[PDB]
């Protein structure tokens, strides 16, 4: 299957998105001390998305999951205005790794349900997705509770990853 | 309780090494070597209840051992354990190995050690005796074997 590493800040929606994608169910979540791994097949293409915890204390542990990954997913809490910076420094440091030069980045702007969630364009501007070089990227405003935008993001991820029908 | 269980031949070569109390890898190897000299040099007519080694944390502990042919079985236990009870447990552990391997032999220690460990895990958990009922321990071993075979 396609090896995808999905990261983000704590409480962003990584676990919720992964479990909704596999089971179609919004499950109650507790902070991920370790990690989660689930293999999801979308449009006949199987994606093994590795859910690594988003807590800062375990953010240094992100190094162990970089190898052989074919895609990066960054669950963006558009409601968390206070941590948009911390998100952008984390993203820039992650892209500084040479191990992720040929991987693909799909940006999930999560938590669109709250009234104070910023639009996806502002998410791109804050994350500097427009300034990336040699990086095939896309952004999709997503909502973990409702699931809107998840299948479009999966479609795009397959499209860049797959090579034929 | 049980600090470590070692199985090794008459040349000091390992057949099983499972520790319960934390030791460095080098310490572990050295404990084995110490134990080897402490056990393999004992005559067949020597009491199976020996003093503990020093690398394990102190001689207060005991080395309960049993051997045959070229194989030595040593149970490193602490000072509060029943040397006699242990010896009984050692023998029935062996009986379990026979029940599960249709007569365990050196080649099972050599090529099936993973299952020996599985069995051992059912016998002892974390240095504490997990099971004393020999038919039940076989039952659970086979229950796992069936699970594996099933899927």
């Amino acid at each position: 299957e396609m090896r995808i590493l999905m990261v983000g800040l704590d409480a962003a929606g990584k676990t919720t998105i992964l479990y909704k994608l596999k089971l179609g169910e919004i499950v109650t979540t507790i902070p991920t001390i370790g990690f989660n791994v689930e293999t999801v097949e979308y449009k006949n293409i199987s994606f093994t998305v590795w859910d690594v915890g988003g807590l800062d204390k375990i953010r240094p542990l992100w190094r162990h999951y970089f190898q052989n990954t074919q895609g990066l997913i960054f669950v963006v809490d558009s409601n968390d205005r206070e941590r948009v910076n911390e998100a952008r420094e984390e993203l820039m440091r992650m892209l500084a790794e040479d191990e992720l030069r040929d991987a693909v980045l799909l940006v999930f702007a999560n938590k669109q349900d709250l009234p104070n969630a910023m639009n996806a364009a502002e998410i791109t501007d804050k994350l500097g997705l427009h300034s990336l070089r040699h990086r095939n990227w896309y952004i999709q405003a997503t909502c973990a509770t409702s699931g809107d935008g998840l299948y479009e993001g999966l479609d795009w991820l397959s499209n860049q990853l797959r090579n034929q029908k | 309780m049980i600090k470590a269980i070692l199985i090794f031949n008459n040349h000091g070569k390992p057949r099983l090494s499972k520790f319960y109390q934390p030791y460095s890898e080098d310490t572990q190897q050295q404990i084995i070597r110490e134990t080897f000299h402490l056990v393999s040099k004992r005559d067949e007519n020597v009491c199976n209840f020996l003093e503990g080694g020093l690398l394990i944390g102190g001689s207060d502990n005991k080395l309960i051992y049993r051997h045959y042919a070229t194989l030595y079985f040593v149970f490193c236990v602490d000072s509060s354990e029943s040397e006699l009870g242990i010896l009984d447990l050692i023998q029935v552990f062996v009986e379990t190995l026979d029940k599960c391997f249709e007569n365990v032999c050196e080649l099972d220690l050599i090529f099936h050690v993973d299952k020996v460990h599985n069995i051992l895990a059912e016998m002892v958990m974390g240095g504490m005796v997990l099971e004393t009922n020999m038919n039940e321990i076989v039952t659970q071993i086979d229950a796992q074997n069936k699970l594996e075979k099933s899927e």
């Binding site: 990690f35 | 890898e25 004393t132």
Partner: protein, 309 residues
Amino acid sequence: MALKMVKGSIDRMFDKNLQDLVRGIRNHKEDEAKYISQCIDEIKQELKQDNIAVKANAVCKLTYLQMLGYDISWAAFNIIEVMSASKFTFKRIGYLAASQSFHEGTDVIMLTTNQIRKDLSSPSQYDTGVALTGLSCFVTPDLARDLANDIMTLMSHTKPYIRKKAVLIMYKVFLKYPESLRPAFPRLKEKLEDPDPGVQSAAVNVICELARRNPKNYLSLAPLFFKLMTSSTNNWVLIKIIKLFGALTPLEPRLGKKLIEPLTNLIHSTSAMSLLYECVNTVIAVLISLSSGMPNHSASIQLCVQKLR
């Protein structure tokens, strides 16, 4: 494409399993260091693959090498992957390796948290049991703090198989995280009442260890230790309780004063010589502490020496 996959399978057929490792070592003893270091490098390459069955095999080989004294800590993350495998047939391998390879000073203590809990929450008693025994040799105070929240629940698991294992690991939890021991102490007292004697026995082993380490918690339990001995028919268990009694009498002679009767009766009923010795040795110590002010201990001694003879 398809033939490249076939090539992988062909190459796989010439790859060494645990037994092949062993056989090669036996055939290359003179070049053992060369052989093994070569195999280790091959393992390093194998662990960079995406085939978990192969990687689990590589871990099996490493586990063997762990027995041989080789440092395989660099593969600990890869071992974790094996533990995170969808099949317990490989998770178990990882847990086996981890029980002898993982250390509290390594970063696996954070990395494994979710997978461990997932296996503990799994309905499969064998997956959970495997995880628990992995933890029995590899667990930290931090893992103890957070995993115990689930393990205490596991001590009420439908199957005694697990309740038993869960009880023994809680001992280690207490050793590393006594803060859980406090609320879990009465729980253990309740686990001593478990209808299934196998679980109950484990509970006895734990509480006896707790009393040994800290006698302040045995006093009010002395009546209970008495009942445990009285009701137990498991010689190993009796040994534990009786030895504990040997360790309790110095602190409370009047306990011994009452115990000496059923202990005498026990000795009369004892058929196992291994038990007999333990019984006799124990009551001798008891009689010594009781000899002051009790001029009938010599009759008890008379019995003791009849048995010693």
